[PDB]
Symmetry: D2
Subunit: 385 residues, 4 copies
């Protein structure tokens, strides 16, 4: 179960670089230089890394320091063959973003947020990123009268429209991906789920430039089924990127390593990506727990990759088993794929076998045989066939 | 706080008519005749009622019995002046719908479901309903391999497209409203939230015919902010109807009377509907608890109405208070309503006050004064001004 | 992975006998005769069955019909070698229990509830049950003013004290087990968790007669860690029985087969029971989903058993691996088992190495190596060693 | 609604002193000197303050600096008449406590934790505190194999036993209060709820010295009913202190001002404390949101107090209304307070009216009239009588 760069595994600098500060505790680890993270990830078999502007260039850096930070990063990429497929902006840490970036009540803040983003899109393109993520962590409220949501969505739409006009004007080959989350750090965050982000996109001036970057733990914080949310994004043709991690239910965002948290959900996710032929990066947005030292950091990052490869093997064995293919037919998955009324509305209306002469009792008595199917899936996941 | 028909309060027959059967207990009340519900609601000040096909005409009724059930209902409407603004289909109770209606794996079931719906649309129009609701309570799964979601969404789209072709062909003046719910009775239900339903609509053949019918308790079962979800639907121009009730957090669907559950959320909802000028029915989808007799039923239905009118008064007092209008300006709600960059992209790019010369520290130090605003809202709700 | 009666697997009659009625749907299966369930379970390798009074003898049965129901049951037990290790009372289905049994506001109801229970304790003893379970599903409220909790706990204590006086007076060899649940069917249920039940026991007249019967899905409906709750019950010496099933988070009670739901939690539970030497029945309180026919029922019941045996094998392989034993020492599990200050308070107070000369920085820098340990556990569960 | 010191309102230094650092953002406010907090709270009408050792004396302070910090604090108390009714220890912030204090795997850590606590008990007594709180925020785990819970509870018991031996030996007049929380910052925390803490106490060497300090938001993070949990603690005679705040459901700990979050729950809590004659401090453990400046801090602290006094007035009006007293009798709250069988077991057994001749149907048909009662409570809370 050894990863290789062909597996397309990616990590954010902020993941293995998290120092361990939480709401109740100080850092337990020293800061990592981005150059060291690049080398250590390459050695483990990763394909590439991602960054927020502030992870690479310290907030308030002069143009000089900015250039120095970039050249050193670029050298590490050349030395290792590591790529940078995605980048994003930090519109959450600095106190000026306390009420949001794109939807802050103060207009001056809103203009500042757009300028900070634009500057990072230029860098992203230079580094060859294909996707630019937006996670609006501060866009939201703790109280009802603090934010008029209709006005807030108008401001959010205005922000994304301007960003689309910018990339178009520049002739850049980059697409945007909105990353939803239901709460934390704000009491409620705008565009809380995959569904809300999808619906919003459809009201932008050039919808083709925007998709979603869903995260396992985010949808789970609302108690939702992650693989179902992913299938809806695929169905809409909007899965531009994905963030993998673990979460144990509805509580604070834990960001466990991928595989931890809801293991069966992880199995069904892998099945789906591999089946649908998803060809983007397999990105890990996680935090090695603050109980660990540096050895523990690298062990947790390696586990992310190892769990995906184990699940891949098991899902493929499941789909290739003749006994499973038979079970799928027993549960009528084949019939779910056929059109309900390719014959058309008139034909359906005239068809007595669809109503007047439909035997409801006989249909009702047919078992779906879902429990035998699910046990085959359990046996495969556990390697107990 | 006396309701009148001009308040547009409506109730489903299945609400005050719920007999009290739950997963662990038998009925505690006898069945109510729809004619009696119509008269008792009219006396309390309701404007109208709604129904599922099966609430009015017992499943498996001959055409004769069907006609008799309708004429008796129609007489009660004429006697009382009660209207029927919405109707829906029961695609959940009968065992044949155990794996869904529109997205059942069995194709024959799927065709049956469409025929049962069509028959009810005709009735709805005859009764003068303006909105037809679809709640797909059985569309979903308990296990991962039982339903291919991509195929399921193709079948769901096919169903709604055929329904749109039908109403168009007939020349009917009716629109559809999809009612989301995250779980219960299925382990996970497809189109779980307001957001997922909005996104789906945009992929139908004639999106203009479809909106949402959100329910307070449904979004709360995912831990989401109901007033925020409503504002997104209004922003999209898709709030065709609304279901009011109460829910105490993330647990089974309680369907308490409106006002019970999350009271502050109810306050912010009323504020929003009244402010935005929502002109549809104020519909109550609730269940008088099984602890009550008939007197308790009517007391609970009356409380639904009374709580909405109390909240209306308080929200209006809040918005009309000079001290609140001042607080809104103090928290920059006025600035949230102004365009970020009406000057355009070039202008923004050239503006040094937006970045190069933006004083981030001064901006950061400005308090938002949200806590004083929220206490004014608390004082108003409690009548403690 | 074939079960045998020596594995101590037990099932309630109400499990494989659930007809499939839910809050939104009619039954999908016909009723099963208890005699048939006994034979079919024996064939699958079960050790025994359990019952509520009403599962075996229909409510309102004459003494004659009662005797007939018992003798037929007893014959099936003799024919198969099946045992009955636990029984309970139905104080939830009948409308008279709408506000509770032991804590109903009406005193007459409360006296009725005690009499119905006593009659079943006699039957239980005759059948050789060792444990009598109490699940107070209707003890609770939907509204704040409906129940004074202090008074309700006085009534609950009075009920259990009388039951203890009864068994003592009769000379019966039976112990009681309280089964907690946080909600459903009541808005809130009294004694919501394992912790609340443990605390209550300590205020009864003869605490030695009472323990807990925790259920996987029940603690998960509060988002709690099931294996941690079990360890506290074991620590107190109160784990008299256990109910196994599956649940996907905080939502309605799903009662999935054991192994489904939170698989890692199931792994850690098995580890704990086997390690601690729990010697009671492994009881399954679950419901085959309403999508299944009879073949699906028996497949789901067999899966319960199969998953426990797979998990048992994996947990035992984990604990026996030399590499894991080393990892446990690396994470200082050995030191967690040693007394903090066997030297005593004075010694601790005088020890400079415990404070004045304690090197906090050196201690802080020591990694706990928990992530490597957890990956060994993942590898073992998945059979990927 | 003006508070006075006779209202017994108290605040932790860490509340109004929270700088606004969260998992995703830097501080938005400067640090407050404890002396300034004391004066500003006194001016608002507070009765007193509480502290963790580290809030008053910076970690690693020399004995000299320690004395200076104390004398300055003591002067502010004398100048204002403010009292200090409770104190606690910080066993969570410093990296050395990354795996816990009392239940850290490393034995040396465990001994350090006890010494740090003891030193603070001495200070607490000198300042005249009556209650010493223990919140074990780091006692727990993110993974199953990292902590053996049975061993962890043995270590927790050992810690509290030593603390009880210490206060006894010293002749101190102080009692301990354990403050439960279900998660955050650890994936799962030991003693997660009020129930688990109550059960644990009963296994300590001198149970009379220990009670609970429950917090509104903590029980709500498990979806539990706070007023019900409080009634159980009162029933056991263990409510030594209480922490008031607000929380909007199952998510991260928000620590909103009291009154915000679940308003009806706040109403029922006030009713209960006032009815039961709770005479301890009304302590606020909350955080003014990071969106606020100093003016916003003091406005939020004042709102805590104002909401309690409004709720007090409304609950008292509710209980004093003749119409409510009648409703309580209609719902049989009077009968819930009478013994079920003061006549004894024999009498109950011989009573035919309790079973043989009990009319179950007549009893079942009696409505509980809970909905009318709950609407009277709503009308009172809203001042709409
Ligand atoms: O909740 C935080 C997000 O997951 C963050 O990692 C985004 O991906 C980056 O802005
Ligand atoms: O969860 C059930 C729904 O709320 C139901 O009332 C729909 O509105 C009608 O099909
Ligand atoms: O939630 C219902 C319970 O789990 C039930 O099965 C009890 O065990 C029997 O009274
Ligand atoms: O969750 C944190 C606690 O509520 C904290 O305030 C304790 O009261 C103090 O140790
Ligand atoms: Mg996250
Ligand atoms: Mg992310
Ligand atoms: Mg509902
Ligand atoms: Mg509804
Ligand atoms: Mg259950
Ligand atoms: Mg059970
Ligand atoms: Mg807290
Ligand atoms: Mg606290």
């Amino acid at each position: 179960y050894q990863p290789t760069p062909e597996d397309r595994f990616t990590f954010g600098l902020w993941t293995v670089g998290w120092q361990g500060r939480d709401p109740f505790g100080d850092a337990t680890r020293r800061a990592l230089d981005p150059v060291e993270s690049v080398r250590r990830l390459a050695e483990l078999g990763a394909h590439g890394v991602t960054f927020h502007d502030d992870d690479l260039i310290p907030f308030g850096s002069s143009d000089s320091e900015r250039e120095e930070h970039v050249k050193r990063f670029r050298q590490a990429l050349d030395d290792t063959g590591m790529k940078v497929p995605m980048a994003t902006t930090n519109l959450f840490t600095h106190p000026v973003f306390k009420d949001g970036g794109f939807t802050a009540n103060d207009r001056d803040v809103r203009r500042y947020a757009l300028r900070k983003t634009i500057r990072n899109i230029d860098l992203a393109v230079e580094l060859g990123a294909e996707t630019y993520v937006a996670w609006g962590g501060r866009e939201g409220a703790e109280s009802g009268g603090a934010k008029d949501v209709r006005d807030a969505l108008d401001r959010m739409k205005e922000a994304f429209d301007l960003l689309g006009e910018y990339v178009t004007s520049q002739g850049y080959d980059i697409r945007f991906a909105i990353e939803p989350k239901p709460n934390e750090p704000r009491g409620d965050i705008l565009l809380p789920t995959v569904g809300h982000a999808l619906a919003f996109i459809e009201r932008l001036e050039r919808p083709e430039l925007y998709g979603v970057n869903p995260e396992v733990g985010h949808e789970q914080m609302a108690g939702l089924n992650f693989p179902h949310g992913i299938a809806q994004a695929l169905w809409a043709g909007k899965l531009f990127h994905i963030d993998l991690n673990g979460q144990n239910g509805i509580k604070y965002d834990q960001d466990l390593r991928f595989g931890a948290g809801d293991l069966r959900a992880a199995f069904w996710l892998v099945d789906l990506l591999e089946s649908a032929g998803y060809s983007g990066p397999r990105h890990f947005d996680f935090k090695p727990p603050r109980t660990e030292d540096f050895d523990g950091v690298w062990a947790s990052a390696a586990g992310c990759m190892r769990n995906y490869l184990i699940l891949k093997e098991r899902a493929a064995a499941f789909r290739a088993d003749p006994e499973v293919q038979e079970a799928l037919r027993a549960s009528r998955l084949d019939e779910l794929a056929r059109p309900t009324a390719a014959d058309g509305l008139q034909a359906l209306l005239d068809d007595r076998s669809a109503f007047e002469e439909f035997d409801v009792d006989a249909a009702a008595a047919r078992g779906m045989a879902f429990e035998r199917l699910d046990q085959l899936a359990m046996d495969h996941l556990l390697g107990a066939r």
